[PDB]
């Protein structure tokens, strides 16, 4: 994707760039259409992750996790 | 260290600079001792400087007690309810004066680690990046290897 | 015993409050706590330098990503934004890449155009006019 | 990129001398200039000392050359006055 | 392969080879130092012209050093310090 | 002079011609004029600005906060015109200087929120078997600024 | 053994080709040197360390003014591989007392006596 | 821009599927393109903790 308009100013001290947004054309669009081991295996295959992420952790790790973390924005 | 200490994101108290700056310190509670030696600088501060400090910023209300509960100490109370209890034990007059001026100039938020040196509510004005910002569209929007 | 330490509890607890989040007897026993806490404080002191280094490599990776998706490379964009006297650092360039992509598109186009002006000037040696965006603003 | 900056006469480091580091960072809303930053005060002192040393060394070597010319000229005068009587 | 004693000491030492940036770095140091040879190749005065032109400044610089070294004497002592130590039990009346 | 169509004959990079500066400076003049109309007619929303304050560049917008690691020598609540703006952009256009924008063109104005110090930071030195252990506690002063306004003038 | 090095006079004789290469002329030599340390005095002998400490070149990458006399040239010839030497060119004269606070040193060597920051 | 918080985050951090032709190519250059895409190093949002990798289908 490349379409912007650059222009050095008259005295040549600032660079003015102009860049409107490219809107998606209507013609480029589609219409809207209208156990325990096996559980880890099924979740791993459905989310494309390893099995190791799905086994639980002990109580020591469950307690250090911050329960009201600082939230920004 | 920082992995043992808590942390917070940088913020103001109540949007303190948009419309008007409001003095975020609410009270100061000096508790000097009359016949004392650790409160020598405290008595110097009370005799010399607390009048000028109380006139310099009238948004704070300053209580001075004699024969304290514990030692010469200052108890700064802020608008968000936070209470900072500093001790002026065995401090001279100028150290007490600059500590009080420090207490007047800060907000009640904790002095724990601040995660970012900046905090923007609306960080993107042209629209935050998603993987389709710079990909071009296709004839009727067909993904690769589609027959029709 | 004429005078002996009545105060040692607060010495131990002065060190120990920094070891509470450790694992095993490092968080209780004071020999192990002093060893590991001194180790952790030295690690913090060196990790400031490593923090600045790692932040810079992160900005370099983000600028490289968002310059590859315009066809450029990282050294082209950095070396040609210098030659326009655009003295933006890496932090700002990476954050413009992340949040504000039309400005990074404009910067990539400026870097590419200054690159092409540099190519035309360097290949065409001799008395030739210099390019427009390759103009240098002098400071005295 | 700071090897190209030397070929333009600019500083190698953009944080060196230039408009980024030798203008005031801030000014009041009224328009009053700020009390100057202490980096510029230190840097002006270093620049002053450099110029003072340039002036002093130039004056010293100029006076040394002039003194040598008077030594040679007085030497030849005393020799010519020993070429008499 | 095994190098017997230690990599960079001894009889059989570890092989090191010179890359291209190593050569180019040595080259640019060589160019800087050759330009230094140039700027040292043209003195402005000779030895008999320079003789004694900075004698006065060098002598007064040593006289400043000498008068700093030979003024090393104990500080004064005042009454007001001792009585300002009396002030440590000031009370309110 | 002539080399036939061969794999190493033509460059792999695509040939590009730069336009000669006559119609290019005409194009530049019309673009600068039209951006100047967008500025004077209020065709911008809120503005962002890369601003070189104390020793580092900040992506500053309106209504927001900055932490600075030094005394600024100002009591709390006074406003500030941050000079050394060095990029200012909107939803549709940017203006970036060489290396700065002029003081007649961008006004960025900030307020001093608070004057704190940092959290107590640890400086600990330790060389092993040499009995080398030193500890220092530092608290660096900090000021937090509220950027109030980034307005722009139609001088191009 | 490794001993202090004498550099023969014949390398410090400027050729006309070098006069064409660098911006120097044999008659009318430059008045002052700008010497800068670009290389560390560790893993150098004690005499080179001494001469760097005693030409005022403690800090690397700082400009330092010295005379163009054969004694300073002798010291600089001892330490000519740790330093970079350029001539102090003066486009205006040496600064008068009113102009001397508002001076500057460009990286090309010149000491301008009018230091502005506004564009041309 | 002007999205709600959850869809904007979902749009930023979603992973994409890239088809990669593999006829007459060396395995190393295909591996370069594939590993750059898999670590998420082709994204300005990239971080090693964020797990912003994508799917690559080398046929």
UniProtKB/Swiss-Prot annotation, chain A:
<dbReference type="GO" id="GO:0003735">
    <property type="term" value="F:structural constituent of ribosome"/>
</dbReference>
<protein>
    <recommendedName>
        <fullName>Large ribosomal subunit protein mL42</fullName>
    </recommendedName>
</protein>
<keyword id="KW-0689">Ribosomal protein</keyword>
<keyword id="KW-0809">Transit peptide</keyword>
<dbReference type="GO" id="GO:0005763">
    <property type="term" value="C:mitochondrial small ribosomal subunit"/>
</dbReference>
<dbReference type="GO" id="GO:0032543">
    <property type="term" value="P:mitochondrial translation"/>
</dbReference>
<dbReference type="GO" id="GO:0003723">
    <property type="term" value="F:RNA binding"/>
</dbReference>
<dbReference type="GO" id="GO:0005762">
    <property type="term" value="C:mitochondrial large ribosomal subunit"/>
</dbReference>
<dbReference type="GO" id="GO:0005886">
    <property type="term" value="C:plasma membrane"/>
</dbReference>
<keyword id="KW-0496">Mitochondrion</keyword>
<keyword id="KW-0687">Ribonucleoprotein</keyword>
<comment type="subunit">
    <text>Component of the mitochondrial large ribosomal subunit (mt-LSU). Mature mammalian 55S mitochondrial ribosomes consist of a small (28S) and a large (39S) subunit. The 28S small subunit contains a 12S ribosomal RNA (12S mt-rRNA) and 30 different proteins. The 39S large subunit contains a 16S rRNA (16S mt-rRNA), a copy of mitochondrial valine transfer RNA (mt-tRNA(Val)), which plays an integral structural role, and 52 different proteins.</text>
</comment>
Swiss-Prot record, chain B:
<comment type="subunit">
    <text>Component of the mitochondrial large ribosomal subunit (mt-LSU). Mature mammalian 55S mitochondrial ribosomes consist of a small (28S) and a large (39S) subunit. The 28S small subunit contains a 12S ribosomal RNA (12S mt-rRNA) and 30 different proteins. The 39S large subunit contains a 16S rRNA (16S mt-rRNA), a copy of mitochondrial valine transfer RNA (mt-tRNA(Val)), which plays an integral structural role, and 52 different proteins.</text>
</comment>
<dbReference type="GO" id="GO:0005743">
    <property type="term" value="C:mitochondrial inner membrane"/>
</dbReference>
<comment type="similarity">
    <text>Belongs to the mitochondrion-specific ribosomal protein mL43 family.</text>
</comment>
<dbReference type="GO" id="GO:0006412">
    <property type="term" value="P:translation"/>
</dbReference>
<dbReference type="GO" id="GO:0032543">
    <property type="term" value="P:mitochondrial translation"/>
</dbReference>
<dbReference type="GO" id="GO:0005761">
    <property type="term" value="C:mitochondrial ribosome"/>
</dbReference>
<dbReference type="GO" id="GO:0003735">
    <property type="term" value="F:structural constituent of ribosome"/>
</dbReference>
<keyword id="KW-0689">Ribosomal protein</keyword>
<keyword id="KW-0809">Transit peptide</keyword>
<protein>
    <recommendedName>
        <fullName>Large ribosomal subunit protein mL43</fullName>
    </recommendedName>
</protein>
<keyword id="KW-0687">Ribonucleoprotein</keyword>
<dbReference type="GO" id="GO:0003723">
    <property type="term" value="F:RNA binding"/>
</dbReference>
Swiss-Prot record, chain G:
<comment type="subunit">
    <text>Component of the mitochondrial large ribosomal subunit (mt-LSU). Mature mammalian 55S mitochondrial ribosomes consist of a small (28S) and a large (39S) subunit. The 28S small subunit contains a 12S ribosomal RNA (12S mt-rRNA) and 30 different proteins. The 39S large subunit contains a 16S rRNA (16S mt-rRNA), a copy of mitochondrial valine transfer RNA (mt-tRNA(Val)), which plays an integral structural role, and 52 different proteins.</text>
</comment>
<keyword id="KW-0809">Transit peptide</keyword>
<dbReference type="GO" id="GO:0005739">
    <property type="term" value="C:mitochondrion"/>
</dbReference>
<protein>
    <recommendedName>
        <fullName>Large ribosomal subunit protein uL30m</fullName>
    </recommendedName>
</protein>
<dbReference type="GO" id="GO:0005762">
    <property type="term" value="C:mitochondrial large ribosomal subunit"/>
</dbReference>
<dbReference type="GO" id="GO:0003735">
    <property type="term" value="F:structural constituent of ribosome"/>
</dbReference>
<dbReference type="GO" id="GO:0005743">
    <property type="term" value="C:mitochondrial inner membrane"/>
</dbReference>
<keyword id="KW-0689">Ribosomal protein</keyword>
<keyword id="KW-0687">Ribonucleoprotein</keyword>
<comment type="similarity">
    <text>Belongs to the universal ribosomal protein uL30 family.</text>
</comment>
<keyword id="KW-0496">Mitochondrion</keyword>
<dbReference type="GO" id="GO:0032543">
    <property type="term" value="P:mitochondrial translation"/>
</dbReference>
Swiss-Prot record, chain H:
<comment type="similarity">
    <text>Belongs to the universal ribosomal protein uL13 family.</text>
</comment>
<feature type="modified residue" description="N-acetylserine">
    <location>
        <position position="1"/>
    </location>
</feature>
<protein>
    <recommendedName>
        <fullName>Large ribosomal subunit protein uL13m</fullName>
    </recommendedName>
</protein>
<comment type="subunit">
    <text>Component of the mitochondrial large ribosomal subunit (mt-LSU). Mature mammalian 55S mitochondrial ribosomes consist of a small (28S) and a large (39S) subunit. The 28S small subunit contains a 12S ribosomal RNA (12S mt-rRNA) and 30 different proteins. The 39S large subunit contains a 16S rRNA (16S mt-rRNA), a copy of mitochondrial valine transfer RNA (mt-tRNA(Val)), which plays an integral structural role, and 52 different proteins. Interacts with OXA1L.</text>
</comment>
